[PDB]
Design a protein around this ligand. Structure first.
Ligand SMILES: Nc1nc2c(ncn2[C@@H]2O[C@@H]3COP(=O)(O)O[C@H]4[C@@H](O)[C@H](n5cnc6c(=O)[nH]c(N)nc65)O[C@@H]4COP(=O)(O)O[C@H]3[C@H]2O)c(=O)[nH]1
Ligand SMILES: [Fe+3]
Ligand SMILES: [Fe+3]
Ligand SMILES: [Fe+3]
Ligand SMILES: [Fe+3]
Lengths: 363, 361
């Protein structure tokens, strides 16, 4: 016997999957799979618009690249420009149809149903299309209603996926650019700030931290030197060696960083604050400001020592050319259990090629 | 038919994919449960790690209600993880009949299932009450609810995630804009409020809700370039001379440099506000002397909100201006310092400005 709620459940299930997916590629996939099943159609395609290349595009197979689709021709095109539904009972009795996919693969297209996709403000942003109804000879009035409702969901989840990406990207740009405010009074390039996070990301990832803490270090670590805004010019700008009144001030950037950052309530800023105050501590317990020992340093500080030191050693600094892999490996191998967490050092060594490819690919 | 319930679910799921407020998401979910399960009421309960209780919202988004996490029906499902199907609430020892006693409701059937996070901890309870047949929840019913509960977990977890991202994005803009705090008197709250004023201004000025959110978060970075000013100036204990003043002016350029080139919209606007906020509508400002609509609108809104905040803050020997005093000032500055069309809008809403200034002291 049959299940009355069968499709309802399928649809709940797709809706859970799509709600967890942050990747537009997979959202488009799951959407088309969903439509094929609920519409009982052999195929489906979502078409979206590109402002800059001025065309529609679509992904044909799982995991292969955009296909450009001419905004002005074909069925999709017509729907896109006019705003209205096309229901082709037979595709071959229709001039707007290009039999060319059809020529080559062993496939005959019979029925086509295509509706527009609207953004929140009623602009047509693309087309949703299904092909070859399986449990009937044509697409019905109800099929149209159904797809109109699907197009509504496709739109919402598509936009929401894009908007989460924009906000994620902005949040990064803001940490990067503001973290580099010290730049008028410190040689450190933009990319130093970025790269330190990228290394610490790999580390946290491979030490097996939760996926969220991985994204956290990636973004907390770059703020490690923010305290430098609180250092006197006479000290921050002085080239070469520092006396022992000046160094004592320069060390204080760890405490300043804490001050700047500890005030938030977000986890990002609790982590960033800890990193700022900790990343010059040392596993031995010798490093400043407090001489914290082993596990007394948070793991996020520990990951940041390693990353901070790596990035410095592999850049030209006054009188020292950047270290190659071989020396850097020798150095970490030496400092294992000394400057650094021994466990994290191993992980770092396992992953050293990636560190260097980050370093090479970000000038 | 039976495409009716799919069309309903797509409808609710469209609303939910857009909704960025948790409380609204819980409302939509419980209305979906009601239509999909053909039942009269539905509640969602979430756990607070902090207060160590469950909570729920009722319709109208009034203050959330504490529910005892240990006892009760949601308490049982929460603690044990088992499903509860009651055929008659009033024959059950675990039911609390006071919600009935106050509302005048009569609870008959209750079905409650747990909600799970990805790591598979119980994070709350989904509860459906009074199936519209007047008879029991069936196994096919329980089964539909396990699936609904799965969608609710997802949309919830997603929405709590989005909120963490929002809240941290703000904290970072605020805390890092106040990075000048070791070398400059401007307060954390000054920085926030300037964006709050700009927000209200942008909204009432007609801008899209996305641009309103932007100015709320861009304007607080207007003074970032102060970081680049030499101590021999920013920290000079005197008044400055003209050579030193010219270097001060540069924090506008320094800001633009720090912020620009960012690919995203937020930073384009911030970089513009930073270079523009000391320009004046009549072209007598600095650093470039831009006139009228050559100053971007986000700049124009910030000039206004920044001056507003200054005039209304006490400094020694100089009490803050009150409402009347301040309004006179903006009227006198219309078309000079400030964009006239925008001052008017600002004036229509000046009570809101003082409210902000009053609560975020
Ligand atoms: N063993 C070894 N470790 C290295 C070397 N170069 C960098 N590091 C490591 O990298 C950390 C941060 O270095 P940085 O990026 O140059 O960032 C430095 C740098 O900007 C500044 N600094 C350190 N020494 C001097 C100095 O003599 N003059 C000036 N102007 N600044 C200095 O203070 C920051 C913190 O430095 P540290 O507390 O020493 O902590 C250092 C140190 O452990 C090296 O050649 N050998
Ligand atoms: Fe440091
Ligand atoms: Fe200022
Ligand atoms: Fe300024
Ligand atoms: Fe200001």
């Amino acid at each position: 016997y049959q299940d009355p709620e069968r499709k309802l459940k399928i649809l709940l299930d797709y809706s859970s999957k799509i709600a967890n997916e942050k990747d537009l590629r997979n959202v488009l996939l799951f959407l088309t799979d969903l439509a094929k099943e609920i519409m009982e159609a052999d195929r489906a395609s979502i078409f979206l618009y590109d402002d800059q290349k001025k065309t529609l595009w679509t992904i044909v197979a799982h995991g292969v690249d955009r296909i450009e689709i001419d905004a002005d021709k074909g069925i999709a095109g017509y729907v896109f420009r006019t705003g209205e539904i096309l229901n082709i009972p037979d595709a071959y009795k229709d001039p707007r149809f290009d039999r060319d996919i059809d020529k080559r693969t062993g496939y005959r297209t019979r029925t086509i149903l295509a509706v527009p996709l609207f953004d929140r403000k009623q602009n047509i942003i693309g087309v949703f299309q299904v092909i070859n109804k399986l449990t009937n000879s044509v697409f019905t009035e109800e099929d149209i209603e159904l797809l109109r409702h699907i197009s509504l969901y496709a739109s919402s989840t598509i936009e929401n996926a894009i908007l989460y990406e924009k906000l994620k990207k902005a949040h990064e740009d803001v940490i990067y650019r503001l973290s580099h405010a010290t730049k008028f009074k410190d040689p450190e390039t933009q990319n130093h700030i970025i790269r330190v996070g990228l290394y610490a990301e790999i580390l946290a990832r491979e030490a097996g931290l939760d996926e969220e803490d991985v994204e956290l270090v990636k973004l907390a670590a770059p703020m490690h030197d923010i305290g430098k805004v609180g250092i006197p010019d006479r000290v921050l700008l002085k080239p070469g060696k520092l006396n022992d009144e000046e160094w004592e001030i320069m060390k204080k950037h760890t405490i300043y960083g804490y001050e700047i950052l500890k005030g938030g309530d977000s986890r990002l800023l609790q982590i960033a604050a800890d990193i700022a105050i900790e990343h010059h501590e040392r596993w031995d317990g010798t490093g400043y400001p407090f001489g914290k020992k082993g596990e007394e340093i948070s793991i996020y500080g520990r990951m940041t020592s390693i990353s901070d030191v790596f990035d410095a050693l592999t850049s030209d600094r006054p009188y020292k050319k950047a270290w190659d892999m071989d020396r850097t490996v020798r150095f970490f191998k030496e400092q294992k259990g000394k400057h650094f967490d021994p466990f994290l050092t191993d992980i770092f060594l396992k992953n050293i090629d990636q560190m260097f490819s980050i370093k090479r690919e970000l000038r």
